[PDB]
Design a protein around this nucleic acid. Sequence first.
DNA 1: CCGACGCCGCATCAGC
DNA 2: GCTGATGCGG
DNA 3: GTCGG
Length: 326
Amino acid sequence: TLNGGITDMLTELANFEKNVSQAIHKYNAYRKAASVIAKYPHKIKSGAEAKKLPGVGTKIAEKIDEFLATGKLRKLEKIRQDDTSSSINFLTRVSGIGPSAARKFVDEGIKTLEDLRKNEDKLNHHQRIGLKYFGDFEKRIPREEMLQMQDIVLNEVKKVDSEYIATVCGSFRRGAESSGDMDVLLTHPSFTSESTKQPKLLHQVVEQLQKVHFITDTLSKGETKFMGVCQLPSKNDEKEYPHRRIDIRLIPKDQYYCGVLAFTGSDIFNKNMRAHALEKGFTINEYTIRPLGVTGVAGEPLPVDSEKDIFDYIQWKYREPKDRSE
DNA sequence: CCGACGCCGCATCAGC
DNA sequence: GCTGATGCGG
DNA sequence: GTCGG
Ligand SMILES: Nc1ccn([C@@H]2O[C@H](COP(=O)(O)OP(=O)(O)OP(=O)(O)O)[C@@H](O)[C@H]2O)c(=O)n1
Ligand SMILES: Nc1ccn([C@@H]2O[C@H](COP(=O)(O)OP(=O)(O)OP(=O)(O)O)[C@@H](O)[C@H]2O)c(=O)n1
Ligand SMILES: [Cl-]
Ligand SMILES: [Cl-]
Ligand SMILES: [Cl-]
Ligand SMILES: [Mn+2]
Ligand SMILES: [Mn+2]
Ligand SMILES: [Mn+2]
Ligand SMILES: [Mn+2]
Ligand SMILES: [Mn+2]
Ligand SMILES: [Mn+2]
Ligand code: NA
Ligand code: NA
């Protein structure tokens, strides 16, 4: 983090553009700039120097020059002082409360943690659980705890059916020493691109994890995606572990490689990789990589037998999970 | 300048 | 109830 | 906000 100060500034800027301005493309531009700057191996000495990076344009170049000179950015100092922006930014920190709901709540005079608690009845289920575990969800997860959580998920899954394969992805697969949450990829041979030979495949698994009191709440749940809350068991007299966010994603077993690539990320890595794919004439999702027709219409799925095979198609050298944290 | 900017699951809403 | 749009977050 | 074209 040679440029930690600059990247923090951009990140705050992006957050403003998303939560207050509701400008998703500006949100993404800042995040892209923050990401590129973040892997740049020199302490940036000037805006001109940063503007050599792809993603960093004239405005960000100017903002960087101001930051390096003063240590601050007037634009931000102002935003920080605007109550509406401050409140909207805060409220969006609760899971399930987005920029729209945040601006709505602040219109009603609901604008603090306390207002939220006193108005649970105005929250949907997701928002209610996000607020319940607000403080908890702020905390990160040491890798040691992720290893613990991994053993529990992987072993309980075999208790439901030994044909199941659960793979922890997200930041954990990228080798991060701590994760904001746990992301699990699930396959079962009875669920492929070609048929759904069994129902409840995800339910079965969610239930068992609840049965053993690992999963504690649910944010949302469908036939292939579960979003909820979990917690490690604590020892005698031991204070309890923080409640943690968990997402489980059941994908067609034949499409594992696109799946694991997709849920491994990072989110920005994906955005960069899929756009380059578009530049190279393919579309990549969590299921498939397909060619674009002269019209811009996805063709048929190409044969994939490894994550590397996906990289090949778009003419990128393979990058280990650890080198995908953009 | 201009159009594009990754791609998708689930929850909720409106409208029929 | 269904279908499409919008929110939200992955 | 940035970029290829
Ligand atoms: N959630 C998972 C994880 C693994 N696989 C299967 O397990 C094999 C590979 O085993 P593993 O080392 O655990 O996964 P990979 O990272 O894909 O290893 P490799 O690249 O050597 O196949 C893959 O062919 C895939 O079919 C699966 O079906 N579902
Ligand atoms: N906008 C997004 C967000 C998420 N992801 C995928 O979902 C995974 C998990 O999402 P998230 O948990 O939010 O990201 P992590 O990289 O795991 O970060 P953290 O350490 O905070 O959990 C990401 O790695 C990425 O593969 C994505 O495709 N696009
Ligand atoms: Cl935008
Ligand atoms: Cl600042
Ligand atoms: Cl597809
Ligand atoms: Mn997170
Ligand atoms: Mn994660
Ligand atoms: Mn996650
Ligand atoms: Mn708790
Ligand atoms: Mn582009
Ligand atoms: Mn240009
Ligand atoms: Na640039
Ligand atoms: Na939120």
